[PDB]
Amino acid sequence: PTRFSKTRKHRGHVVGMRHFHLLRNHYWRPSINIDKLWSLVPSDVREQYLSGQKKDTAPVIDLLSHGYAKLLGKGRLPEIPVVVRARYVSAEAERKVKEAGGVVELVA
Amino acid sequence: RTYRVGDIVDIKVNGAVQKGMPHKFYHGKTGVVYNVTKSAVGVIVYKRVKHRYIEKRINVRIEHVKPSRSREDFLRRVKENAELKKKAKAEGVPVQLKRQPAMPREAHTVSIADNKPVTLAPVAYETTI
Amino acid sequence: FKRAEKYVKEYREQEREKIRLARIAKQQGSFHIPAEAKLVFVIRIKGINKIPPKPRKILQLLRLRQINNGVFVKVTKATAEMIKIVEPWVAYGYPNLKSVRELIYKRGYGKVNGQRIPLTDNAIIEENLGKYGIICIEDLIHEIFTVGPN
Amino acid sequence: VQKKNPLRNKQIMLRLNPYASTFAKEKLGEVKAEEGKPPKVPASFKELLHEA
Amino acid sequence: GIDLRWKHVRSSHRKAPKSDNVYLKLLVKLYRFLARRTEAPFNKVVLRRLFMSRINRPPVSLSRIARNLKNGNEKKTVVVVATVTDDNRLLQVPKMEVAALRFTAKARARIEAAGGRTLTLDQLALEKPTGANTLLLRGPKNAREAVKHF
RNA sequence: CGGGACCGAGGACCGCGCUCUGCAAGGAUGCUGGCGUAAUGGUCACCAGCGACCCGUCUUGAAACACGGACCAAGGAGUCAAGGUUUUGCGCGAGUGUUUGGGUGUAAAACCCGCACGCGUAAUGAAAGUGAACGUAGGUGAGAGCUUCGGCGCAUCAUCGAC
RNA sequence: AGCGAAUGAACUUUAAAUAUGUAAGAAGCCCUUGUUACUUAACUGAACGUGGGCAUUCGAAUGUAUCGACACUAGUGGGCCAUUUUUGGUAAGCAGAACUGGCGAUGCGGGAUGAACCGAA
């Protein structure tokens, strides 16, 4: 608005290589850390899994459906076996998943 | 005298070499040593410009540098304050720990019998003759 | 009431004591040198224009910021040197009991919580100086005149 | 609401100092000196005073 | 003229919120009354934090509350003058009583699911009018892109 | 103990007190006269005493110099857009953004809808690539507030560690 | 000042005026313990840490609406005059620096009058 301006008050006083034809879709690979891995589970099934109402079933998570290609290992995981299907994985993330009791499966 | 970093020193340029001194401001100044050389020393001096202090650094030969006694009185006073406080706690009597400014003199009487005053003129008559 | 009676008696006795000591020395053939003054009243009589920074700072520390302002100063060397430096702006001297009581009775204002409150009651002096034993204006006058511990 | 001079108003004097009435009645500002014949000044004081 | 080398300083802190929230104005009135009529410094601090802006009131997460609830602070009432946000990296939530300006829906749902309770600041003033048994928490003030770019 | 000038702020009581039937003690009341209207007061024109360079701009440190101004009416000069940044208010909150579009409509309004996408949620390297818990997410010194009074210690700061 | 003290501004028992540097506490003072990659003939000093002792007065005066850290914004940043100090000069003028004060930004009383004078803002 013009009426709030200061000029109304001042009225009367005046490296590296070059990549030709780059395609970002080649290097598209979004990543998620393992402390947000349980957030991809739907909330109510996540609550039964965390409470301990499912002693005979394990969840399978597909990261490509949620929009992620690499599973990274920031944070910690509970002692629940989780099957993870990811395009990429880091070594310590896979170690923490196996310590939790699940398995990391590679998909394309 | 082997000077060390952090020692507080006084600067006195001895001799009548004042014909061509570049900086006579630091003569008689006190500063802190930051660098030591075999015949030189680095002195931090503070100058006052109006309301603020500016920091200057000089290189002075050892022949014009003497150790300062600025904190000698403070360390000494700390020592007898501790010792007389221990003595006061031993004997159970209060004692003064604070130095005080000079107080005005009290009333007193001056005898005249052997000290008769001499009358003086604005000039001496022995000088008049 | 009793304390004011004691103070009046003490003033009379100290005056007669000084007179008696002077007379005794004169009769014995000597001179009694009186004690140097312990209290100085200082009045700023020159303005705030064209003043060097050191006298400016000394007048600030002596609380003489306006012309015709007066303060009481206990005589030490540390204050005597300051007053000697700010001599070209002040007039100072040794006040007597009448000067002290006139100043405190007529122009007596206390600093209470950073405010300038007139001394209209003994109560203000009592809650502002009762921890030092000064409970009324007569104690205040006695302390200022005799230069007590407070 | 109004600062009153205790040296002009006797009531303010009596409020600030209850001994003022006793001072005025007993006339302690008019006390005479102690009795007794004063001894004279010694002579040597006078020759010292008038010595050129 | 009077010589004032120093200058009287106007207040450099907020005395009233810039917000036009009527419920916030009611909360300010309530805590002004509380800070005037009680000796507890908690009421004055809560009034000052009600005065502050949003960048001076960073959000506090459930993980931060669960961190501060440890070591004998389990039964204390958590007071946060800010928005309490949910943190999904915290998989299990301890039982807690939290009084805040506002809660996110997920944070309130997770607290009530874990078995704790959520309060407004007026409910806090009614249950703990002197701020007894309270744990006062702030969020990370310097965790902002502007603060990083400073 | 007289003589004179200026002032009367507040508006039940509270207080300090005193000479204690009351009071000169936290701010003026009592008695009386004339008039009840241009009498007090106000505006305009003029005279009298005292005071008082013509405005704006430029310059430098400043004046001076210089430039503009015959008079009056109307017009007349830091605005809009895009992109940033800091602060303020608001909504939601690890999410957020309906309005490219579709549905609908009392039809350029209002209301509704969702896929993608932008920003944020992970950085580093020229790149290939790799990718953030030894510990109640560490130890120490402060630190508002709370406390069962032993301590717990927000934000933040300093420092030593860890990834 | 004395040299009825020694010796002879360069003599000193003692000691100027003027402003001026440094320091004046628990955030500090030491002691002890060890290491040293410093240094020292050297476990010797010092630094680095460790532990302990010192709160019986917190260790001069005066003053203290005087705190600190950010964020954003603006003008001016090799101007004039004067006191003092100092370096040079000229036939005489004058020219450099350092501090302070005033002015440019300032009204008022007095210097008959006024950028630089006095009082006072």
Coordinates of N, CA and C (backbone and C1' of nucleotides) in Angstrom, one line a residue, chain F residues 104-158:
Chain F
rU104 P -19.6 -30.1 -13.7 O5' -19.9 -29.0 -12.6 C5' -20.5 -29.3 -11.4 C4' -20.5 -28.2 -10.4 C3' -21.2 -26.9 -10.7 O3' -22.6 -27.0 -10.4 C1' -19.0 -26.4 -9.9
rG105 P -23.6 -26.2 -11.3 O5' -23.5 -24.7 -10.8 C5' -23.8 -24.4 -9.5 C4' -23.3 -23.0 -9.1 C3' -23.8 -21.9 -10.0 O3' -25.1 -21.4 -9.5 C1' -21.5 -21.7 -9.8
rU106 P -26.1 -20.8 -10.6 O5' -25.7 -19.3 -10.6 C5' -26.6 -18.3 -11.1 C4' -26.5 -17.0 -10.3 C3' -25.1 -16.5 -10.0 O3' -25.0 -15.1 -10.1 C1' -26.4 -16.7 -8.0
rA107 P -24.2 -14.4 -11.3 O5' -22.9 -15.3 -11.4 C5' -21.6 -14.9 -10.9 C4' -20.5 -15.1 -12.0 C3' -20.7 -14.4 -13.3 O3' -19.4 -14.1 -13.8 C1' -20.7 -16.7 -13.7
rA108 P -18.6 -12.7 -13.4 O5' -17.2 -13.3 -12.9 C5' -16.7 -14.5 -13.4 C4' -15.2 -14.4 -13.6 C3' -14.4 -13.8 -12.4 O3' -13.2 -14.4 -12.2 C1' -14.0 -12.6 -14.4
rA109 P -13.0 -15.5 -11.0 O5' -13.8 -14.9 -9.8 C5' -13.3 -13.9 -9.0 C4' -14.3 -13.4 -8.0 C3' -14.5 -14.3 -6.8 O3' -13.5 -14.1 -5.8 C1' -16.6 -13.6 -7.7
rA110 P -12.6 -15.3 -5.3 O5' -13.7 -16.2 -4.4 C5' -14.4 -15.6 -3.4 C4' -15.6 -16.4 -3.0 C3' -15.3 -17.9 -2.8 O3' -14.8 -18.1 -1.5 C1' -17.2 -17.7 -4.1
rC111 P -13.6 -19.2 -1.2 O5' -14.3 -20.6 -1.4 C5' -15.4 -20.9 -0.5 C4' -16.1 -22.2 -1.0 C3' -15.2 -23.4 -1.3 O3' -14.8 -24.1 -0.2 C1' -16.7 -23.1 -3.1
rC112 P -13.4 -24.7 -0.1 O5' -13.5 -26.0 -1.0 C5' -14.4 -27.0 -0.7 C4' -14.6 -28.0 -1.8 C3' -13.3 -28.7 -2.2 O3' -13.1 -29.8 -1.4 C1' -14.5 -28.0 -4.2
rC113 P -11.5 -30.3 -1.1 O5' -11.2 -31.0 -2.5 C5' -11.8 -32.2 -2.9 C4' -11.4 -32.6 -4.3 C3' -9.9 -32.8 -4.4 O3' -9.4 -34.1 -3.9 C1' -10.7 -31.7 -6.3
rG114 P -8.2 -34.1 -2.8 O5' -7.0 -34.8 -3.6 C5' -7.2 -36.0 -4.3 C4' -6.6 -35.9 -5.7 C3' -5.1 -35.7 -5.8 O3' -4.4 -36.9 -5.5 C1' -6.2 -34.3 -7.3
rC115 P -2.8 -36.9 -5.1 O5' -2.1 -37.0 -6.5 C5' -2.2 -38.3 -7.3 C4' -1.6 -38.1 -8.7 C3' -0.2 -37.7 -8.8 O3' 0.7 -38.7 -8.6 C1' -1.5 -36.4 -10.3
rA116 P 2.3 -38.4 -8.3 O5' 2.9 -38.1 -9.7 C5' 4.2 -37.4 -9.8 C4' 4.1 -36.3 -10.8 C3' 5.0 -35.1 -10.5 O3' 6.3 -35.3 -11.0 C1' 2.8 -34.3 -10.9
rC117 P 7.6 -35.2 -10.1 O5' 7.9 -33.7 -10.1 C5' 7.9 -32.9 -11.3 C4' 7.6 -31.5 -11.0 C3' 8.4 -30.8 -9.9 O3' 9.6 -30.4 -10.3 C1' 6.1 -30.3 -9.6
rG118 P 10.9 -30.4 -9.3 O5' 10.7 -29.0 -8.5 C5' 10.7 -27.8 -9.2 C4' 10.4 -26.6 -8.2 C3' 11.1 -26.7 -6.9 O3' 12.5 -26.2 -7.0 C1' 8.9 -26.2 -6.5
rC119 P 13.7 -26.9 -6.2 O5' 13.5 -26.4 -4.7 C5' 13.5 -25.0 -4.4 C4' 12.9 -24.7 -3.1 C3' 13.5 -25.5 -1.9 O3' 14.7 -25.1 -1.4 C1' 11.1 -25.5 -1.8
rG120 P 15.9 -26.1 -0.9 O5' 15.2 -26.7 0.4 C5' 15.1 -25.9 1.6 C4' 14.3 -26.6 2.6 C3' 14.8 -27.9 3.1 O3' 15.9 -27.8 4.0 C1' 12.5 -28.1 2.8
rU121 P 17.1 -28.9 3.9 O5' 16.4 -30.3 4.5 C5' 16.0 -30.3 5.8 C4' 15.2 -31.6 6.1 C3' 15.9 -32.9 5.7 O3' 16.8 -33.3 6.7 C1' 13.7 -33.0 4.8
rA122 P 18.2 -34.0 6.3 O5' 19.1 -32.8 5.7 C5' 19.2 -32.6 4.3 C4' 20.7 -32.7 3.9 C3' 20.9 -33.1 2.4 O3' 22.2 -32.5 2.0 C1' 21.8 -34.8 3.7
rA123 P 22.2 -31.0 1.3 O5' 23.8 -30.6 1.6 C5' 24.2 -30.4 2.9 C4' 25.5 -31.2 3.2 C3' 26.6 -31.1 2.2 O3' 27.4 -30.0 2.5 C1' 26.2 -33.4 2.7
rU124 P 28.2 -29.2 1.3 O5' 29.4 -30.2 0.9 C5' 30.4 -30.5 1.8 C4' 31.2 -31.7 1.4 C3' 31.9 -31.6 0.0 O3' 33.1 -30.8 0.1 C1' 30.8 -33.6 0.2
rG125 P 33.5 -29.8 -1.2 O5' 34.0 -30.8 -2.3 C5' 35.1 -31.7 -2.0 C4' 35.3 -32.7 -3.1 C3' 35.2 -32.2 -4.5 O3' 36.4 -31.5 -4.9 C1' 34.0 -34.2 -4.3
rA126 P 36.3 -30.2 -5.8 O5' 35.4 -30.6 -7.1 C5' 35.0 -29.7 -8.1 C4' 35.1 -30.3 -9.5 C3' 34.4 -31.6 -9.6 O3' 33.0 -31.5 -9.9 C1' 36.6 -31.7 -10.6
rA127 P 32.0 -32.5 -9.2 O5' 32.3 -33.9 -9.9 C5' 32.0 -34.1 -11.2 C4' 32.7 -35.4 -11.8 C3' 32.2 -36.7 -11.1 O3' 31.1 -37.2 -11.7 C1' 34.6 -36.6 -11.2
rA128 P 30.1 -38.2 -10.9 O5' 30.9 -39.6 -10.9 C5' 31.1 -40.3 -12.1 C4' 32.1 -41.4 -11.9 C3' 31.7 -42.5 -10.8 O3' 30.8 -43.4 -11.2 C1' 34.0 -41.8 -10.5
rG129 P 29.3 -43.5 -10.6 O5' 29.5 -43.4 -9.0 C5' 29.9 -44.6 -8.3 C4' 30.9 -44.2 -7.2 C3' 30.4 -44.3 -5.8 O3' 30.4 -45.6 -5.2 C1' 31.6 -42.3 -6.1
rU130 P 29.1 -46.1 -4.3 O5' 29.4 -45.4 -2.9 C5' 30.6 -45.8 -2.2 C4' 31.0 -44.8 -1.1 C3' 29.9 -44.4 -0.1 O3' 29.9 -45.4 1.0 C1' 30.7 -42.4 -1.0
rG131 P 28.6 -45.8 1.7 O5' 28.1 -44.4 2.4 C5' 28.7 -43.9 3.6 C4' 28.3 -42.5 3.9 C3' 26.9 -42.3 4.3 O3' 26.7 -42.6 5.7 C1' 27.4 -40.7 2.6
rA132 P 25.2 -42.6 6.4 O5' 25.3 -41.6 7.6 C5' 25.7 -42.0 8.9 C4' 26.4 -40.9 9.6 C3' 25.7 -40.3 10.8 O3' 26.0 -41.1 12.0 C1' 26.5 -38.5 9.5
rA133 P 24.8 -41.9 12.6 O5' 25.4 -42.3 14.1 C5' 26.6 -41.7 14.5 C4' 26.8 -41.9 16.0 C3' 27.0 -43.4 16.4 O3' 27.9 -43.4 17.5 C1' 25.0 -42.6 17.5
rC134 P 29.5 -43.2 17.3 O5' 30.2 -44.3 18.2 C5' 29.7 -45.6 18.3 C4' 29.8 -46.2 19.7 C3' 29.0 -45.5 20.7 O3' 27.7 -45.9 20.8 C1' 31.3 -45.9 21.5
rG135 P 26.5 -44.9 21.1 O5' 26.6 -44.6 22.7 C5' 26.6 -45.7 23.6 C4' 27.0 -45.2 25.0 C3' 26.1 -44.3 25.7 O3' 26.0 -44.6 27.1 C1' 28.2 -43.3 25.5
rU136 P 24.7 -45.0 27.8 O5' 23.5 -44.3 26.9 C5' 23.1 -42.9 27.2 C4' 21.6 -42.8 27.0 C3' 21.1 -41.4 26.6 O3' 19.9 -41.5 25.8 C1' 20.3 -41.9 28.8
rA137 P 20.0 -41.6 24.2 O5' 21.2 -40.7 23.8 C5' 21.1 -39.4 23.5 C4' 22.4 -38.7 23.2 C3' 22.5 -37.2 23.2 O3' 23.8 -36.8 23.6 C1' 23.0 -38.0 21.0
rG138 P 24.0 -36.1 25.1 O5' 25.5 -36.6 25.4 C5' 25.8 -38.0 25.7 C4' 27.2 -38.1 26.0 C3' 27.8 -37.2 27.0 O3' 27.6 -37.5 28.4 C1' 29.2 -37.3 25.1
rG139 P 27.4 -36.4 29.5 O5' 28.9 -35.9 29.7 C5' 29.9 -36.8 30.3 C4' 31.3 -36.2 30.4 C3' 31.3 -34.8 31.1 O3' 31.3 -35.0 32.5 C1' 32.6 -34.7 29.1
rU140 P 30.6 -33.8 33.4 O5' 31.5 -32.6 33.3 C5' 32.9 -32.7 33.8 C4' 33.7 -31.4 33.4 C3' 33.1 -30.1 33.8 O3' 33.4 -29.8 35.2 C1' 33.8 -30.0 31.5
rG141 P 32.2 -29.1 36.1 O5' 32.3 -27.6 35.6 C5' 33.5 -26.9 35.8 C4' 33.3 -25.4 35.3 C3' 32.0 -24.8 35.6 O3' 31.9 -24.3 36.9 C1' 32.6 -24.4 33.3
rA142 P 30.5 -23.9 37.5 O5' 30.2 -22.5 37.0 C5' 28.9 -22.1 36.7 C4' 28.8 -21.0 35.6 C3' 27.4 -20.5 35.3 O3' 27.0 -19.5 36.2 C1' 28.6 -21.0 33.3
rG143 P 25.8 -19.8 37.2 O5' 24.5 -19.6 36.2 C5' 24.3 -18.4 35.5 C4' 23.5 -18.6 34.2 C3' 22.2 -19.3 34.4 O3' 21.2 -18.5 34.8 C1' 23.4 -20.4 32.6
rA144 P 20.7 -18.5 36.3 O5' 19.1 -18.2 36.2 C5' 18.6 -17.0 35.8 C4' 17.5 -17.1 34.9 C3' 16.2 -17.7 35.4 O3' 15.4 -16.9 36.2 C1' 16.7 -18.6 33.3
rG145 P 15.0 -17.2 37.7 O5' 14.0 -18.5 37.5 C5' 12.8 -18.4 36.7 C4' 12.3 -19.7 36.2 C3' 12.1 -20.8 37.3 O3' 10.8 -20.6 37.9 C1' 13.4 -21.7 35.6
rC146 P 10.6 -20.9 39.5 O5' 10.7 -22.5 39.6 C5' 9.7 -23.3 38.9 C4' 10.1 -24.7 38.9 C3' 10.3 -25.4 40.2 O3' 9.1 -25.8 40.9 C1' 12.1 -26.0 38.7
rU147 P 9.0 -25.7 42.5 O5' 10.0 -26.8 43.0 C5' 9.8 -28.2 42.8 C4' 11.0 -29.0 43.0 C3' 11.4 -29.1 44.5 O3' 10.7 -30.1 45.3 C1' 13.3 -28.7 43.1
rU148 P 10.1 -29.7 46.7 O5' 11.0 -30.4 47.7 C5' 10.5 -31.4 48.6 C4' 11.5 -32.5 48.9 C3' 12.9 -32.3 48.5 O3' 13.8 -32.9 49.4 C1' 12.1 -34.1 47.3
rC149 P 14.3 -32.1 50.7 O5' 15.9 -32.0 50.5 C5' 16.5 -31.9 49.3 C4' 17.4 -30.7 49.2 C3' 17.6 -29.9 50.5 O3' 18.9 -29.4 50.6 C1' 16.8 -28.5 48.9
rG150 P 20.2 -30.4 50.9 O5' 20.7 -30.7 49.5 C5' 22.1 -31.2 49.3 C4' 22.1 -32.5 48.5 C3' 22.4 -32.4 47.0 O3' 23.8 -32.2 46.8 C1' 20.6 -33.9 47.4
rG151 P 24.2 -31.6 45.4 O5' 24.1 -32.7 44.3 C5' 23.8 -32.4 42.9 C4' 22.4 -32.8 42.6 C3' 22.0 -32.5 41.1 O3' 22.4 -33.5 40.2 C1' 20.3 -31.7 42.6
rC152 P 22.8 -33.1 38.7 O5' 21.4 -32.9 38.0 C5' 20.4 -33.9 37.9 C4' 19.1 -33.4 37.3 C3' 19.3 -32.7 36.0 O3' 19.4 -33.6 34.9 C1' 17.8 -31.5 37.4
rG153 P 20.6 -33.4 33.8 O5' 20.2 -32.3 32.8 C5' 20.8 -31.0 32.8 C4' 19.8 -29.9 33.0 C3' 20.1 -28.7 32.2 O3' 19.6 -28.8 30.9 C1' 19.6 -28.1 34.5
rC154 P 20.3 -28.0 29.7 O5' 19.1 -27.2 29.0 C5' 17.8 -27.8 28.9 C4' 16.8 -26.9 28.1 C3' 17.4 -26.1 27.0 O3' 17.6 -26.8 25.8 C1' 16.1 -24.7 28.4
rA155 P 18.9 -26.6 24.9 O5' 18.8 -25.1 24.4 C5' 17.8 -24.6 23.5 C4' 17.7 -23.1 23.5 C3' 18.9 -22.4 23.0 O3' 19.1 -22.3 21.6 C1' 18.1 -21.4 25.0
rU156 P 20.4 -22.9 20.9 O5' 21.5 -21.8 21.4 C5' 21.5 -20.5 21.2 C4' 22.3 -19.6 22.1 C3' 23.8 -19.9 22.1 O3' 24.5 -19.3 21.1 C1' 23.0 -19.8 24.4
rC157 P 25.8 -20.0 20.4 O5' 26.9 -19.6 21.5 C5' 27.2 -18.3 21.8 C4' 28.1 -18.2 23.0 C3' 29.4 -19.0 23.0 O3' 30.4 -18.4 22.2 C1' 28.4 -19.2 25.1
rA158 P 31.4 -19.3 21.2 O5' 32.4 -19.8 22.3 C5' 33.2 -18.9 23.0 C4' 34.0 -19.7 24.1 C3' 34.7 -21.0 23.7 O3' 35.9 -20.7 23.1 C1' 33.5 -21.3 25.8

